[PDB]
Design a protein around this ligand. Structure first.
Ligand SMILES: CC(C)(COP(=O)(O)OP(=O)(O)OC[C@H]1O[C@@H](n2cnc3c(N)ncnc32)[C@H](O)[C@@H]1OP(=O)(O)O)[C@@H](O)C(=O)NCCC(=O)NCCSCC(=O)O
Ligand SMILES: CC(C)(COP(=O)(O)OP(=O)(O)OC[C@H]1O[C@@H](n2cnc3c(N)ncnc32)[C@H](O)[C@@H]1OP(=O)(O)O)[C@@H](O)C(=O)NCCC(=O)NCCSCC(=O)O
Lengths: 429, 429
């Protein structure tokens, strides 16, 4: 008997994994997987194997994998709206469960995320009173903190449920959070950029991406496809990235999913992280102000470097090759917006930047990362408010970090609490 | 010539340290300081040496040290208001600089934190419109996120300063943040618990703790001393604790100090972390509802355990002995509130809990941590709104995490970005 329910599948999956990780540890817990050096410690844990994070794994050379699925594999395997790009809904199923969903599974996520998307009056209030000089990432993160009022996990805990059931309330709060996100994000958009307008209603019959582009106010049918692609690829990027790691750290202490996502956002907002989104456009925007020569392009790049700034959109803590997400995005431009002058500048930069970065001899990875290519896409469709881009990253990111959050608590991962040391201390060691 | 300025001292200190860490690494960067096992990875980095954090170091047996100063040493060495307890101001100097401040230094922090304490209208607004069912930690964290509008670092970055000067703007934003904190915290207090009342003005002539207790509305002169003690001891606790680590992680991405503190708060709000403050009181509050026997006390403790809950206030990820902060607090009660029945219950619990926890055989550290003893102190003075306690922890914590934040950027610590791995991946390794 019966029909679709991710929670029921999860209920079947949790014990098996539990069992699976216990024996493995029973035989291998003592196994040394690596060493820790002084340089690693002073270096941002660079190179340290520190966390278990199941939904995605990043390879230095190949780039990110969703099961063990690459982006190109996803592109082909996840269901589409009708009509070429993968639905983030499907990606979500995949991350959570390990399996590729059927269209029908996927339609369930949509309907479910539509049913859940409702914003409480205190939140609508705050967002409406916020200043327009308050950064959109800020506005977003405060709003999601303010939603914790509603946490099902926070309430359950308060009531004293048994640890074992944590994963269950975490999942409710995760599905609700994901549902609400686009409404908060769009209300911010509308407030800042479309004063006096309203985000409108969620239509249970559309997919999450499309409802989002509706609330944003975009009509272009290719924009909708860009959206689906965007939110899918930005999903997850293994556990060690700042945003994911922050949510993992905060969530380990038993802060509900709302609070942990919000702190995640404060991390995504950093220039070295997701704000790169925005930094790239601004830097292009300056570049153009000051159709240029490779040589003038090269002078420009030098002057950034010489000034103690970074060139945004290039480099990566783990990747050592061009980000497939970058490729992914290039391939979308080549199809749809090949004559775009901003596009052409980004294509041209790919020719120079790496070379300049190899010349300088500092960046361990001179190739571009996702952020170098994403804004150019948005701008083309009319979405030119750059300080807003990171919000969109914020939205996607929720898919991966929440999908994992549920597993963490399901597997009972404890408090993340490493040892620190001071220089004096280490000097002495 | 001239008078006091922490920034000038810092300017003198930064290069030397820089130099000091470079050579050390030049000779020892390759040195293996430790190994990483599977259990560590599945275990919350328990036992992993992962971060350099200079302001404080925690010893498993002795407990926390500010330089290399213990709490008892601080108690004696830091200047006092007139009149027995150390001024958090002094502690702050100590953390930042490595040295014990003179009274006169310390008076400068006070005057400085008084000059800086000013809240922008958008923030006052939001706090005033917040619901009373929105948790105080939530209210706090949203407010500090909303303050990022004002970040001096966020602005400088935007302007493109050279990396080298980051520490300078981080310090301004840190001193401003610390200054404002008590105003935000008190406005929350006043709103939730003292409706219609106003926090009043900051008096440049008092010390930070006293202005705070004024804005809170407390008059008792011993309360003021409790406050000074509270905010000092809760200062810092090395780098690996959830809140500190979160700020370190977020700040590494170049999110301004406001954003990084806020996420820190989302971490402090977790039940396994600072919310323990509050959890302890509530659990005592239940206990009393349901002058009892050790045996009835023991039954109660069992029933929590048997129900898959934790006994709050006991256990620690690193300490292996009674927290000196706990002692510190006990010694304050014994002096001032020795007949308090809540006090007596906490004294009695110390007799039983550990034993029950040893009996159960799960907690690696059966002794109590700071949180087991702090609320009992507050309640005695009339501050009985338990859901508020963690705010106070939030306030103190700012001293340590901001003092370090400044050093991180000063020493140029890069993006924190470790590698993760999935179970499948590890299984394969
Ligand atoms: C992403 C990164 C933080 C990785 O940092 P890392 O692992 O510490 O880099 P690395 O190991 O190559 O660093 C070696 C040196 O090269 C420098 N370097 C690396 N990338 C860059 C860059 N794009 N521009 C200029 N210098 C750079 C790096 O700052 C360091 O200089 P120093 O020794 O004085 O501190 C860095 O490449 C960078 O700052 N990139 C620019 C910001 C950016 O595009 N971020 C997005 C990354 S991925 C997508 C996202 O997260 O949103
Ligand atoms: C603070 C702790 C999270 C440390 O966690 P840990 O390093 O993973 O503890 P551990 O190594 O002793 O854990 C071994 C087992 O004992 C359990 N245990 C440890 N402390 C407790 C406790 N107070 N009550 C019951 N069981 C406990 C722990 O949950 C684990 O059970 P399981 O194997 O099923 O997951 C834990 O002691 C605990 O949950 N304490 C209660 C919450 C609390 O008081 N937190 C404040 C800590 S310090 C001040 C602050 O941060 O605000």
């Amino acid at each position: 008997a019966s029909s679709t329910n991710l929670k029921d599948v999860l209920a079947a999956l949790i014990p098996k994994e539990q069992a699976r990780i216990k024996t493995f540890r029973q035989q291998h817990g003592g196994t040394a997987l690596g060493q820790i050096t002084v340089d690693m410690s002073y270096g941002g844990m660079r190179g340290m194997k520190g966390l278990v994070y199941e939904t995605s794994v990043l390879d230095p050379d190949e780039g990110i994998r969703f099961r063990g699925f690459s982006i190109p594999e996803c592109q082909k395997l996840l269901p589409k709206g009708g009509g070429g790009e993968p639905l983030p809904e499907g990606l979500f199923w995949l991350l959570v469960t390990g399996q590729i969903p059927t269209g029908a599974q996927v339609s369930w996520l949509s309907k479910e995320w539509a049913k859940r998307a409702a914003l409480p009056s205190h939140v609508v209030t705050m967002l409406d009173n916020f200043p327009t000089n308050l950064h959109p990432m800020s506005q977003l993160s405060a709003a999601i903190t303010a939603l914790n009022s509603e946490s099902n996990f926070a309430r359950a805990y308060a009531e004293g449920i048994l640890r074992t059931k944590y994963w269950e309330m975490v999942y409710e709060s995760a599905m609700d959070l994901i549902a609400k996100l686009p409404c908060v994000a769009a209300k911010i958009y509308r407030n800042l950029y479309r004063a006096g307008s309203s985000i409108g209603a969620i239509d249970s019959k559309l997919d999450w991406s499309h409802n989002f582009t509706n609330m944003l106010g975009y009509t272009d049918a290719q924009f909708t496809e860009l959206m689906r692609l965007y939110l899918t690829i930005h999903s997850d990027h293994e556990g060690g990235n700042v945003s994911a790691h922050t949510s993992h750290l905060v969530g380990s202490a038993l802060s509900d999913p709302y609070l942990s996502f919000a702190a995640a956002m404060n991390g995504l907002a950093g220039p070295l992280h997701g704000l790169a989104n925005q930094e790239v456009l601004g830097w292009l925007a300056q570049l153009q102000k000051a159709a240029g020569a490779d040589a003038s392009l090269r002078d420009y790049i030098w002057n950034t470097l010489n000034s103690g700034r970074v060139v945004p959109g290039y480099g990566h803590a783990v990747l050592r090759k061009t980000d497939p997400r970058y490729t992914c995005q290039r391939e979308f431009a080549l199809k749809h917006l090949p004559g775009d002058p901003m596009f052409k500048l980004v294509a041209q930069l790919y020719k120079i930047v790496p070379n300049v970065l190899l010349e300088q001899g500092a960046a361990a990875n001179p190739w571009p990362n996702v952020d170098a290519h994403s804004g150019v896409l948005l701008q083309y469709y009319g979405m030119t408010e750059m300080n807003y881009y990171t919000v969109l990253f914020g939205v996607s990111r929720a898919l991966g970090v929440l999908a994992q959050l549920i597993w963490s608590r399901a597997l009972g991962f404890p408090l993340e609490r490493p040892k620190s040391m001071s220089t004096d201390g280490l000097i002495a060691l």
